[PDB]
Amino acid sequence: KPKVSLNPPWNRIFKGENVTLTCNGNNFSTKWFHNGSLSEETNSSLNIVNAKFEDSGEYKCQHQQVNESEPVYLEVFSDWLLLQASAEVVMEGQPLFLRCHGWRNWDVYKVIYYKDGEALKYWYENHNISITNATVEDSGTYYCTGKVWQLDYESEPLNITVIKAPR
Numbered sequence: 001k002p003k004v005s006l007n008p009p010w011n012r013i014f015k016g017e018n019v020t021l022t023c024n025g026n027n028f029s030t031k032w033f034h035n036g037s038l039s040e041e042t043n044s045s046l047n048i049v050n051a052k053f054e055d056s057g058e059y060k061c062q063h064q065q066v067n068e069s070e071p072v073y074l075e076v077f078s079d080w081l082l083l084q085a086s087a088e089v090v091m092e093g094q095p096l097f098l099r100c101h102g103w104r105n106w107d108v109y110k111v112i113y114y115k116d117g118e119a120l121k122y123w124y125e126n127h128n129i130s131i132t133n134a135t136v137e138d139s140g141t142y143y144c145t146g147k148v149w150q151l152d153y154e155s156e157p158l159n160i161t162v163i164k165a166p167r
């Protein structure tokens, strides 16, 4: 029962960005499955360079633990704004991180986050928001808006569900 982790953390990235996938920490060869297809990659870390839409999908890893890991889903976008989340499924009590990310890392200003239409009441800083103690109420669909260069943009919406800690 290994686990795929990403670095950076975001599973929603921009076309052309990089993301590294690592199979669990007890592993000191690895088997990777992209959309259920055995990869040619055998190291404990899978590197996705200059992300393609094709790289989107389900990724599972396999170590000498005779049991594949839970899947992880990657999605590549091309837009001016992209709402990134630490997780699309957060356990109650854990933190939830959101980031209104701009294409090419352009600076984003006047960042506003929305949850089910309503603009977030929580207090937050520019383009990086931290929700420390996730609650069932933090479930909802989110998206953000911000000013890039001289115009105002809006990211695609994302759905975030908060489940209970137990099993």
Ligand SMILES: *[C@@H]1O[C@H](CO)[C@@H](O[C@@H]2O[C@H](CO)[C@@H](O[C@@H]3O[C@H](CO)[C@@H](O)[C@H](O)[C@@H]3O)[C@H](O)[C@H]2NC(C)=O)[C@H](O)[C@H]1NC(C)=O
Residues within 6 Å of the ligand: 034, 035, 053, 054, 055, 056, 057, 058, 074, 075, 076
């Ligand atoms: C793995 O499976 C996923 C299905 O969840 C595949 O993702 C889909 O891939 C396409 C690109 O092939 C994504 O982009 C679309 O492509 C067209 C043509 O290039 C583009 O013009 C559209 O604007 C659109 O972006 C599509 O969004 C994507 N779906 C998701 C949910 O990410 C993926 O390609 C599969 N990879 C392999 C190697 O099988």
Ligand SMILES: *[C@@H]1O[C@H](CO)[C@@H](O[C@@H]2O[C@H](CO)[C@@H](O[C@@H]3O[C@H](CO)[C@@H](O)[C@H](O)[C@@H]3O)[C@H](O)[C@H]2NC(C)=O)[C@H](O)[C@H]1NC(C)=O
Residues within 6 Å of the ligand: 141, 158, 159
């Ligand atoms: C992200 O979450 C939202 C809401 O949680 C999803 O949109 C909602 O989708 C449901 C169906 O899954 C819509 O309800 C349906 O309405 C039709 C017509 O009245 C009815 O016949 C069906 O029985 C069902 O009740 C609902 O209106 C819609 N809400 C909104 C605000 O659009 C959305 O699909 C999710 N996105 C993804 C990618 O999962």
Ligand SMILES: *[C@@H]1O[C@H](CO)[C@@H](O)[C@H](O)[C@H]1NC(C)=O
Residues within 6 Å of the ligand: 016, 017, 018, 049, 050
């Ligand atoms: C991704 O990594 C490669 C080197 O492995 C680098 O040349 C490229 O600039 C990186 N892409 C981004 C968007 O940083």
